[PDB]
Amino acid sequence: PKSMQCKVILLDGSEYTCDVEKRSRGQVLFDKVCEHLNLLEKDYFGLTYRDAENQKNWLDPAKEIKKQVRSGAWHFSFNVKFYPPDPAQLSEDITRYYLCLQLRDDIVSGRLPCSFVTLALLGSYTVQSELGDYDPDECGSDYISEFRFAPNHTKELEDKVIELHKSHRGMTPAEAEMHFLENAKKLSMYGVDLHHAKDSEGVEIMLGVCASGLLIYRDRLRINRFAWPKVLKISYKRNNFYIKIRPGEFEQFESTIGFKLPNHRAAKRLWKVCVEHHTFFRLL
């Protein structure tokens, strides 16, 4: 029985290596990674791979790994798939820990934009969680943390992390991680999966998929929102992604909104992540 080597980038930046039977479904590898991580609340997470176009795809746990990675390497990342709107309701601290690690990468990467003050506050909770109580013996007036806090680091940001770190004396790792999440969850782009698209007129937009629904960012002025309740039907055909918006009270007909994606694979990927978000956040 022939086995394929899998390499998974974990949220702490380390690499997990295991073997699965070459006809294995994605769930097999996912269960191995979750066992390695001592993770029980697995429903929020998934594995990603890069397709032949170098796009991030979710590994479908129900389908064979080889029919997804196809010609590519058996290289994956472990990631948060469904960002819980209320992390306080997760049953385990270790779940919240992995959610923190993902969010720290969302911030450093620039996927999750954040004010100066919130970068410093999130940073201060990470330091409290990881080093414990502020000690002046480590940090002088010229201190720069090994911790990556932001897409662009400044001395003023490092200073503000330390000033807020001082305020967290006696805070336990679980407590600091919960505070991290209470702040991160409020950011306007928290758990928003962005897809480049064009509207029915050819104007470039972004489509965001998240717990509350489908967001349409036309620019900073003009943001349309479709709560999962208000979106009746989803579809994709060729390069195009359509949403069927349920009739308002006393309106005779559902309305249809069409978007143009870069290519057919981009339209299918957006369709699938929307169907999955709708199912998950309908049930949660």
Ligand X SMILES: COCC(=O)Nc1ccc(O)cc1
φ/ψ (deg, to 5) at 141: -65, -20
Q: How far is the CB of 69 from ligand X (least distance, A)?
A: 24
CB of 132 or CB of 258, closer to ligand X: 258
| Residue 209 beta carbon to ligand X: minimum distance, rounded to whole angstroms | 10
Q: Which is nearer to ligand X, 113 or 229 (CB)?
A: 229
CA 64 to chain centre: 23
CB nearer ligand X, residue 123 or residue 213: 213
Query: Using H for helix, E for strand and C for coil, what is the string for 132-194?
Result: CCCCCCCCCCCCCCCCCCCCCCCHHHHHHHHHHHHCCCCCCHHHHHHHHHHHHCCCCCCCCEE
Contacts of 190 (CB under 8 A, 6+ apart): 83, 103, 112, 184, 210
Distance of alpha carbon 152 from alpha carbon 71, whole angstroms: 36
Nearer CB in complex with ligand X: 40/275:
275
Residues in contact with ligand X by CB under 6 A are: 228, 231-234, 274-275, 278
Q: How many CB atoms lie within 10 A of CB 99?
A: 25
The burial of 273, by beta-carbon neighbours within 10 Å (0-12 exposed, 13-18 middle, 19 or more buried), is given as: middle
User: In terms of CB distance, is 134 or 271 closer to ligand X?
Assistant: 271
Of 22 and 237, which has the nearer Cβ to ligand X? 237
Kindly tell me which of 194 and 234 has the beta carbon lying closer to ligand X: 234
CB closer to ligand X, 58 vs 76: 58
* HSE-up (13 A, CA, CB side) for residue 194: 14
Provide the minimum distance between the beta carbon of 79 and ligand X in the complex, in angstroms, as a whole number: 22
SS3 35: helix
Do the beta carbons of residue 98 and residue 180 sit within 8 Å? no
Q: Any idea how long the chain is?
A: 284
CA distances from 208 to 57, 83, 167, 271 (A): 16, 13, 36, 12
| Nearest approach, Cβ of residue 142 and ligand X (Å) | 53
CB of 46 to ligand X, least distance (A): 18
CB of 97 to ligand X, least distance (A): 31
Minimum CB separation of residue 257 from ligand X in Å reads 12
| Shortest Cβ 222–ligand X spacing (Å) | 22
Q: What is the largest CA-CA distance in the chain?
A: 71
